[PDB]
């Protein structure tokens, strides 16, 4: 009854960062080695916990949030960061405990003519709270006149599409990101190591 981390990391399709996906992992035995002994990853940043010891530990739940961003924004998926992704799309708390794993997916998420299916939120009335997901598609009102649901003067589309082209520089290429959060409640622990 291994934990279904394969269906998270090896998922054929990933979500947009504004609509980031969450998979709850529970009642499972996990082998985190397969993750931290892999050579397929570009970023593997852990916070408040050692992955090398995750197989000796137990947890109530593990949340696996996955999405796609561009390379130069992977730095934003960390506690205490700012910018469009951290403010408007996916925000980590200061007391984050878990790991942030990313790898270049240019061969999968870019295509000739551009892949415009991956979007991120460009405007918002306020910064997101930790782990808040906003899938609003309302025209952003930047001025005094209501927008009446259409784009116009001082009223902008809230979401912006990534221009993923195979010729993009590496910092503008798509990167698939998986954020593992480890939850310990005053309850039985159901995600454990071998």
């Amino acid at each position: 009854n291994l934990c279904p981390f394969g269906e998270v990391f090896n998922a054929t399709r990933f979500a947009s960062v504004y609509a980031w996906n969450r998979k709850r992992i529970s009642n499972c035995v996990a082998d985190y080695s397969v993750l931290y002994n892999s050579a397929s990853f570009s970023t593997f940043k852990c916070y408040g916990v050692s992955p090398t010891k995750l197989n000796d530990l137990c947890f109530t739940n593990v949340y696996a949030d996955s999405f796609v961003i561009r390379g130069d924004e992977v730095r934003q998926i960390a506690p205490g960061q700012t910018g469009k992704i951290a403010d408007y799309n996916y925000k980590l708390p200061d007391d984050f405990t878990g790991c942030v794993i990313a790898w270049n997916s240019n061969n999968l998420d870019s295509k000739v003519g551009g892949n415009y299916n991956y979007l991120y939120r460009l405007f918002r009335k306020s910064n997101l709270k930790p782990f808040e997901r906003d899938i609003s598609t309302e025209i952003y009102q930047a001025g005094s006149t209501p927008c009446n649901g259409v784009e116009g003067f001082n009223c902008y589309f809230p979401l912006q599409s990534y221009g993923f082209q195979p010729t993009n520089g590496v910092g503008y290429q798509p990167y698939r990101v998986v954020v593992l959060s480890f939850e310990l409640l005053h309850a039985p622990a159901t995600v454990c190591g071998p």
Partner: antibody
Amino acid sequence: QVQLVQSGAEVKKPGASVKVSCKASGYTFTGYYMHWVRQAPGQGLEWMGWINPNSGGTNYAQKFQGRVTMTRDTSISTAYMELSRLRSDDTAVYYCAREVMVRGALPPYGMDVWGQGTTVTVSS
Amino acid sequence: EIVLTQSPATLSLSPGERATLSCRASQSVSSYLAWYQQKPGQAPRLLIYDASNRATGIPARFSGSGSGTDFTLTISSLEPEDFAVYYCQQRSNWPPVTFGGGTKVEIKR
């Protein structure tokens, strides 16, 4: 495949209105904005507005806001553009063009299919 | 309304020559630049979307690039059917759609 077929040429008087239809075929009507663009003799292209065929909402160009009315009949996949209080300088060819809709985002693919155009001559 | 500055107004070139057309886009927070071709008595036809990508059925000789507010449509070698008028269009928030003034590519002789 995708096809936009407009109604025939029209001649009107400098007070009347004109209603041009644009029947869409070969694709899902409710998926794409329907824009209207007009071209006066020897002149360039001017945007008139778009309609969302799914919701029926519209977004009109500044020049025509107040006397243009865009409607749709989804059951027959047809868009309609009515121009009221016509003047002689409203004489032009009027085109429908589709543009894919993206919820919450600007469309990137442009106006990829146009109608054949409808000549509208306004004169006394 | 606002019209995008297309340059030059008329391009006189010989068949097989390289064609370079310029469009200065308006200032925008976010927008998409497209290029269309129009022959006499016909509707415009999409050539390029997002400044750089060929539309479906567009021959390889058509290409496009963009830096800042200056966008360029290039035809590597003009064919007889390529002599026509060309319009840049900008899709944005305000105005939602803006057109260029058009560049006519005529046959030099």
